[PDB]
Design a protein around this motif. Structure first.
Motif, PDB file in Angstrom:
ATOM      1  N   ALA A  10       0.884  -1.146   0.000  1.00  0.00           N
ATOM      2  CA  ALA A  10       0.000   0.000   0.000  1.00  0.00           C
ATOM      3  C   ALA A  10       0.940   1.219   0.000  1.00  0.00           C
ATOM      4  CB  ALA A  10      -0.839  -0.015   1.260  1.00  0.00           C
ATOM      5  N   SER A  12       1.245   3.534   2.080  1.00  0.00           N
ATOM      6  CA  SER A  12       1.685   3.848   3.416  1.00  0.00           C
ATOM      7  C   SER A  12       2.708   2.857   3.928  1.00  0.00           C
ATOM      8  CB  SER A  12       0.452   3.919   4.288  1.00  0.00           C
ATOM      9  OG  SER A  12      -0.552   2.936   3.921  1.00  0.00           O
ATOM     10  N   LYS A  52      -9.741  -2.056   5.135  1.00  0.00           N
ATOM     11  CA  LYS A  52      -8.843  -1.524   4.137  1.00  0.00           C
ATOM     12  C   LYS A  52      -8.659  -0.009   4.276  1.00  0.00           C
ATOM     13  CE  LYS A  52      -7.589  -1.132  -0.638  1.00  0.00           C
ATOM     14  NZ  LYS A  52      -7.928  -0.252  -1.738  1.00  0.00           N
ATOM     15  N   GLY A  53      -7.395   0.381   4.478  1.00  0.00           N
ATOM     16  CA  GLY A  53      -7.012   1.783   4.582  1.00  0.00           C
ATOM     17  C   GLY A  53      -7.240   2.381   5.969  1.00  0.00           C
ATOM     18  N   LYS A  54      -7.451   1.561   7.018  1.00  0.00           N
ATOM     19  CA  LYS A  54      -7.699   2.087   8.347  1.00  0.00           C
ATOM     20  C   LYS A  54      -6.653   1.510   9.283  1.00  0.00           C
ATOM     21  CE  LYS A  54     -12.284   3.603   8.132  1.00  0.00           C
ATOM     22  NZ  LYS A  54     -12.402   4.006   6.736  1.00  0.00           N
ATOM     23  N   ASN A  69      -1.697   0.793   8.751  1.00  0.00           N
ATOM     24  CA  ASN A  69      -3.034   0.555   8.217  1.00  0.00           C
ATOM     25  C   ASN A  69      -3.137  -0.774   7.505  1.00  0.00           C
ATOM     26  OD1 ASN A  69      -3.424   3.154   9.135  1.00  0.00           O
ATOM     27  ND2 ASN A  69      -2.963   3.965   7.133  1.00  0.00           N
ATOM     28  N   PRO A  71      -3.871  -3.136   4.689  1.00  0.00           N
ATOM     29  CA  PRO A  71      -3.943  -3.057   3.242  1.00  0.00           C
ATOM     30  C   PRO A  71      -5.236  -3.602   2.674  1.00  0.00           C
ATOM     31  CG  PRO A  71      -2.085  -4.485   3.938  1.00  0.00           C
ATOM     32  CD  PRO A  71      -2.638  -3.769   5.145  1.00  0.00           C
ATOM     33  N   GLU A 110      -9.958  -6.472  -3.238  1.00  0.00           N
ATOM     34  CA  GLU A 110      -9.173  -5.388  -2.690  1.00  0.00           C
ATOM     35  C   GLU A 110      -7.708  -5.458  -3.030  1.00  0.00           C
ATOM     36  OE1 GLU A 110     -10.279  -5.971   1.234  1.00  0.00           O
ATOM     37  OE2 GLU A 110     -11.303  -4.040   1.294  1.00  0.00           O
TER      38      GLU A 110
END
Ligand SMILES: *C(=O)CCCC[C@@H](CCSCN)SSCCO
Length: 131
Positions: A10, A12, A52-54, A69, A71, A110
């Protein structure tokens, strides 16, 4: 920075290794390098859901505390309890012993929105070059 060929990444700086019913998650070699010595990891409890993304945990180094976070989305079936005794495993083996959580992914498609290895190496080049 080593970047492994079969992982998805990801922006990040977290990777996912997908193996059927299970996805393992950790931060990359790039991420640990820029963090410095990791002194603490906050990991979720098993049975918890991650999205996802948190952020699902945090990694505390001698110099920073960053969110890690998820992925992809799913359920934490297992946590690397090895990171309680040696947090540094994230520095020494970001892709093998320094894995953070193993999830049962709930939304497989995802994976297709994540960066493959050349796209992530290139993005890391662009980041290294942005200073
Ligand atoms: C020192 O001040 C560095 C802060 C830590 C940055 C690294 C965190 C990785 S943990 C995964 N979310 S990444 S390099 C800067 C952002 O791309």
């Amino acid at each position: 920075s080593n970047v492994l060929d079969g992982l998805k990444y990801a922006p990040s700086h977290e990777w996912v290794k997908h193996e059927g019913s299970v996805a393992t998650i950790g931060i990359t070699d790039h991420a640990q390098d820029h963090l410095g010595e990791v002194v603490f990891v906050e990991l979720p409890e098993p049975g918890v859901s991650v999205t996802k993304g948190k952020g699902f945990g945090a990694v505390e180094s001698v110099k920073a505390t960053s969110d890690v976070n998820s992925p992809i989305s799913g359920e934490v079936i297992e946590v690397n309890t090895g990171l309680t005794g040696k947090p540094g495993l994230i520095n020494s083996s970001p892709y093998e012993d320094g894995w953070m959580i193993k999830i049962k992914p709930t939304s497989p498609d995802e994976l297709e929105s994540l960066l493959g290895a050349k796209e992530y190496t290139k993005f890391c080049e662009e980041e290294d070059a942005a200073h």
